[PDB]
Amino acid sequence: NIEIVSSGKHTLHGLNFYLSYFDDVAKVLPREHYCFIVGGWVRDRILGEPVGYNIDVDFLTTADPVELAKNFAKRIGGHFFVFEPTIASVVLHLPPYRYRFDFSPLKGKDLEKALIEDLKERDFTANAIAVNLDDVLSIGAKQTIVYDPTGGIKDLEQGLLRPVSIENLKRDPVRVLRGFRIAIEKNLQLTEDFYEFVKEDPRIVLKSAVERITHELFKIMKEKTAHKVIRELYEYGVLEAIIPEIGRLREVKDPLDEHTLKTLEYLEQVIEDRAKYLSAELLENFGKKRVLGEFTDVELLKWGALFHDIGKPQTFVTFYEHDKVGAQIVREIGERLRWGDEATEFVAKLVRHHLRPFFLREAFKKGELKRRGMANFWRECGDIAPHLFLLSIADAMASGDEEEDIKALMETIAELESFNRNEMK
């Protein structure tokens, strides 16, 4: 119930909160109804982060969210969706850039009290900050006012990601994933009560719908810091709760879980270096295969790194058939988690063949690698080939292979690529 005026903040200026499409929103917005910008986009803008290729904006309007979203989508030429208190979305997709605009209802007799009331229900204080669209677009002699009753700005200045209330986390448990992800993504420290809450009941996440769970999970696999978030989820037992198979990696000692985590961690680096190992023709369409509509085959690759050996706990001196077992397990997880059919099949096929480049490498070191094995390789799997290459390199690194052996693997890959490029006609 108290405002404060500050000067030189320069991140809170309406100018900073601007987006071109907001104009279109304002033109679709009815005259007698109001609209606010909330959460993620506000948070990122306050932090002064440069806007990337993925733009997500959340709205709270007193108008009809469905009609608003419909006509706005008609204006920007986007796809209009309705799901779920029914919030409506607008997605706009071109290959380098993705746009998503969510529209949520805001109702009450007192508008300000209602807005605050809604902000206090949100997951984290950083995401609890909102601004009026009119104030943002209001060109002249207009001061812009930001609303954070939860003190999100104060927490952002101190570099803390603090849940508004633990009850808000218990109400929608999938947010406990976001808390980790964002904490790594925005380089913020999660406060004490979050860590405590988490420890006590890690399985809480199972309350939330599966699809939502899946969606966040990929969102984690989407960022380049993903291995850290995955390790965080594993150490606190959340990952085991979501995927019980992962917990079984611990019973088998060589440590398998550490090997998988390091496999993912190295896989990120290898992905960054992919231009080095992969051929140009393999790099052209790499990462361009769309999965679950906002995600690519790269997330599937990282999932492949997590599951690359999931079958070693099932088989027990030497682990023989764990590739096929792993493939089946992955298929089961993909069904359970409602991953796309072609997605779970992709990851499954990736896990099935995960040790193939190692065999071809062993054949390469003995000089016994010839046209037969290569042609057989490219015939059997040509679709997962680049992903399988990167995965194999990462797995080789995490296994602590000798440098000459890793280089032998890389040269094996290069030989397969060169054989496929020219000498296959």
The domain limits of the chain are: 1-157, 158-425
Burial of 10 (0-12, 13-18, 19+ CB in 10 A): exposed
Is 383 annotated to bind a ligand? Reply is: no
Is 336 annotated to bind a ligand? Reply is: no
Is 122 annotated to bind a ligand? Reply is: yes
Is 177 annotated to bind a ligand? Reply is: yes
CATH 3.30.460.10 assigned to 1-157: yes
Is 421 annotated to bind a ligand? Reply is: no
Is 176 annotated to bind a ligand? Reply is: yes
Is 172 annotated to bind a ligand? Reply is: yes
Q: What is the resolution of this structure in A?
A: 3.4
Is 40 annotated to bind a ligand? Reply is: yes
Is 179 annotated to bind a ligand? Reply is: yes
> Rounded to 5 degrees, what are φ and ψ at 69?
-65, -40
Is 371 annotated to bind a ligand? Reply is: no
Is 56 annotated to bind a ligand? Reply is: yes
Is 311 annotated to bind a ligand? Reply is: no
Instruction: Give the Cα separation of 19 and 364 in Å (integer).
Output: 55
Is 291 annotated to bind a ligand? Reply is: no
Method: X-ray
Is 42 annotated to bind a ligand? Reply is: yes
